[PDB]
Amino acid sequence: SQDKWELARANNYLGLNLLKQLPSNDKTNVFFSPFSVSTAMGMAYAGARGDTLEQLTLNFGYAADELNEGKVLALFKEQLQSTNDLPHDYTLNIANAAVAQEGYGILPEYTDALTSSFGAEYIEADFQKRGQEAIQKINAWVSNRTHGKVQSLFDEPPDFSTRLILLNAIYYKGTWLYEFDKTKTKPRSFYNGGVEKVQVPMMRLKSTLNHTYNAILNADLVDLPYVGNDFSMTIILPREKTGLASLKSVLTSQTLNLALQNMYPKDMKLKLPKFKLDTKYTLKPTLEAMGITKIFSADADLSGISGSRNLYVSDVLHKAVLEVNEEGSEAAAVTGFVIQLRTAAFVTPPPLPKVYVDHPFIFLIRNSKTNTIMFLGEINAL
């Protein structure tokens, strides 16, 4: 459907723009869920009016009158049901909420939209008088919704003047279609920051994988499907050891899709690090860098939340957790070299091609059906 495609495109545009705007250095890994950020923007969209709404939509190239709010919420609703219907092999715990200063008003149309479209809760708290209790209620909510994988979003009470905060926490561990062999996992060389050689737990696979070399990105792309090929992890490995910054500067929704369309199966050797990521961002400054300003300003119009223009977003908090290890459903298979033999002979198959993920790279976990990027990582450092 062209509508599902348009939502995946907005989502992927937001994700790759976030990646170019997030603070980073050669010693720390970036990891976030564009899907979670899209959900925080969806929650604002469902309640925004006037110039606040027009800035949100025009950011994605739409006048508010080129959109049906109903059809946008229905596309989010469809996305939510597809994630709730994932098999047991996927551990995906999503926690979405708006937390408002008490006594501003809540429209049931808005809380109904939060539940059905976003799996989101609306929570009232007193940041002025009961800041300490507000963070105990939030920490308990996120702990409950993430099955204890995220215990806290706040260490200290937020500011006296806090009006509304958007919270999006997500945990993911998937099962590979093709298991890596636990016995082949060893410390192997990785270039931290593209420069500093260290030994790190490296998994080893020999299998038929979708792959392409893409000249515009100057990178190998490898697809590793999860079970039911519902999600796949795309590795984008720059050919230059220090190529990551260059890769980031040319990676767009357009250039990614062109590379993905050229992938075809082949037998290959893959070396991929075993790693866990746990990241937390205060997204207001990054979203403002991208041109989302009015939701955060004193002139915000979120009258679709409360029934009046009395709310603005104090901040957007995002926490994302990923585990990557060997576990898969089926053993690794290679097709082998196919030859039509006429005359009996000694036949030497050509050497298998190699993608050794041994320097900084990007990965995307995406919905194979819709090409929605669920997760995006830059690994600089293991």
Author numbering: 5 to 96, 97C, 98 to 386
The authors write:
Finally, we resolved the crystal structure of Iripin-8 at 1.89 Å resolution to reveal an unusually long and rigid reactive center loop that is conserved in several tick species. The crystallographic asymmetric unit contained a single molecule of native Iripin-8. Electron density was of sufficient quality to model all residues from Ser5 to the C-terminus, including the entire RCL. Iripin-8 has the typical native serpin fold with a Cα RMSD (root-mean-square deviation) of 1.93 Å compared with the archetypal serpin alpha-1-antitrypsin (A1AT, 342 of 352 residues). The most remarkable feature of Iripin-8 is its long RCL (11 residues longer on the P′ side), which extends away from the body of the serpin, moving the P1 Arg364 17.8 Å further than the P1 residue of A1AT. This extended conformation is not the result of a crystal contact; rather it forms the basis of a crystal contact with the RCL of a symmetry-related molecule. The P′ extension contains a stretch of proline residues that form a type II polyproline helix, conferring rigidity and extending the P1 residue away from the body of Iripin-8. We can infer from this that the extended RCL is a feature of native Iripin-8 in solution and that it has functional consequences in determining protease specificity and/or inhibitory promiscuity. We also observed several molecules of PEG (polyethylene glycol) originating from the crystallization buffer bound to Iripin-8. One of the binding sites was a deep 109 Å3 cavity in the core structure between helixes A, B, and C.
